[PDB]
Design a protein around this ligand. Structure first.
Ligand SMILES: *[C@H](Cc1ccc(C(F)(F)F)cc1)C(=O)O
Ligand SMILES: *[C@H](Cc1ccc(C(F)(F)F)cc1)C(=O)O
Lengths: 298, 297
């Protein structure tokens, strides 16, 4: 019922102690993990993954609780869907494949999993790439009226259950599509493959998957923030050589000077703006792929 | 049929150029206007209004677009549901009854209509009372992680249509009940009268009324903010002698309310009340006496 946007890629259901992680696996060479964000799945990499496959062994994984990944039971602190736990679970997953030192690239929620992984376990990463994000700490500290209105859903979805859930039940199709079109450059869905939008909408049409997304944004308003406050108070920087890509019309640039912020969180960081909205790998696939290939190859 | 929580009070469909304002009207003496808020209707004053009617001509009106008042067609800048436009419409309504200089008390959304009225047309108000609020500018300007999480619906309901409307249409009864409960001390509907809740529920059950509420919160995120900002930068303060009532466990106090209003008013008194956000329904007696003692000085 859902299209194949990764021709040639296999399908792996990697076992962890918190549940199965689904991923499309293609190419050969150095291991490169790709992590998606909200409200998308692994298929958001379908326009750049084949190019990366020509050079690397590309693992395109659904986040814990997302897509076809299992949904581990959450708790009163939203632990399994905190960026620290997600990182632990994916580290565990990559160990099942023999990948204990790999390249990592993330977008939105996946980028947050990524930099948290780098802080907690720098050893697991050769190079890091974060796409159109700032540290979760940075958004909350810089929170103003402009901030609050634009990215309203950081506060909205972090509301205690079942208030966001019950509201999302009203028109999940509309909401998930609105979340996609609102952060592009054109303001519509033209950037997204209609088949890819189907993957997103189908997953979002399930109440259980939506609950996970809320538990995600709850973690991002509490545990993730507290985890980030500890680091920023200690003065810990990410030692992993990392790349920061953001859309010129993206979310991160309206907030701050992206590479100036990431220089405060990482000692070895380079970055560039790309003519795009928030959804870089779909809006500007050629440039995004090129940036990643050249960076991970160096 | 909805309950009549105002024994003796007549009903009024007051014509304005922007549409009819419904109000319950009772008592006699100096004229006193009561303006409700979100997500309520005029029946929120039902526990304190009779006490007030012993000494005043009490006019309990539904805000334009709210409850039983008509719904003026809105526009791209949400003009008719800005606080400036609401105040003008109510000034018209009061002028119909022969009231061109009156006393005014407001809560939540209505209190924003009220101080905006004080700023734009100070001559219209003998005395002013605002309940459990800060100026709209103050909330947006002091926005942080805490306020983002604590009062999220300022940003959520302000999202461009029809994003909030389509979400609210799913489970409207749940949302309106949660909104009433969440800001009380007990965190339930126990402080409210069931019949009052049904008034709030039925109104909130109409999708057109729900759209009006969003237009209200859209105005409060933009045009209202900008209007307030103009007064901040120009050093304009409310000359109308006012009283700032707020709940000790309410929304307004979670800043030091009296200090904030002193920046906005050159003659303002302030006192806390053992209550959540809905003082006239959580602490009706303390609110009743405070209002009576203030407008009767
Ligand atoms: C996805 C949306 C998003 C993206 C980027 C930022 C910021 F401000 F950090 F750059 C905030 C929100 C997500 O929630 O991660
Ligand atoms: C009603 C809810 C409300 C009340 C008071 C405040 C604050 F923080 F300004 F005092 C915010 C929100 C309303 O929408 O005004």
């Amino acid at each position: 019922d859902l299209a194949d946007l990764f021709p040639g890629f296999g399908s792996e259901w990697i076992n962890t102690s918190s549940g199965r992680i689904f991923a499309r696996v293609g190419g050969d060479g150095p291991p490169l993990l790709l992590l998606h964000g909200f409200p998308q799945t692994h298929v958001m990499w379908h326009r750049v993954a084949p190019k990366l496959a020509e050079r690397f062994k590309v693992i395109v994984a659904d986040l814990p609780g997302y897509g076809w990944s299992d949904m581990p039971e959450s708790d009163e602190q939203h632990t399994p869907y905190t960026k620290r736990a997600m990182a632990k679970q994916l580290i565990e997953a990559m160990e099942q494949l023999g990948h204990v030192h790999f390249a990592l690239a993330g977008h939105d929620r996946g980028a947050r999993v990524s930099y948290r992984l780098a802080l907690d376990s720098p050893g697991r990463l050769s190079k890091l790439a974060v796409l159109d994000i700032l540290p979760t700490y940075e958004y909350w500290q810089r929170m103003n009226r402009a901030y609050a209105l634009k990215i309203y859903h950081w506060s909205f979805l972090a509301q205690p259950a079942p208030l966001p859930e019950n509201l999302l039940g009203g028109d999940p199709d509309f909401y998930v599509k609105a979340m996609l079109a609102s952060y592009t450059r054109a303001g519509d869905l033209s950037a997204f493959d209609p088949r890819a939008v189907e993957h997103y909408r189908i997953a979002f049409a399930d109440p259980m998957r939506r609950h996970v997304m809320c538990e995600d944004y709850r973690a991002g308003a509490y545990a993730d923030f507290e985890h980030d406050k500890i680091d920023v108070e200690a003065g810990n920087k990410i030692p992993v050589p990392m790349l920061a890509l953001w859309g010129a019309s993206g979310i991160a640039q309206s907030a701050a000077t992206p590479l100036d912020v990431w220089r405060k969180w990482a000692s070895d960081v380079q970055g560039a703006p790309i003519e795009s909205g928030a959804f870089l790998p779909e809006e500007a696939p050629d440039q995004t792929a090129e940036a990643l290939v050249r960076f991970f190859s160096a």
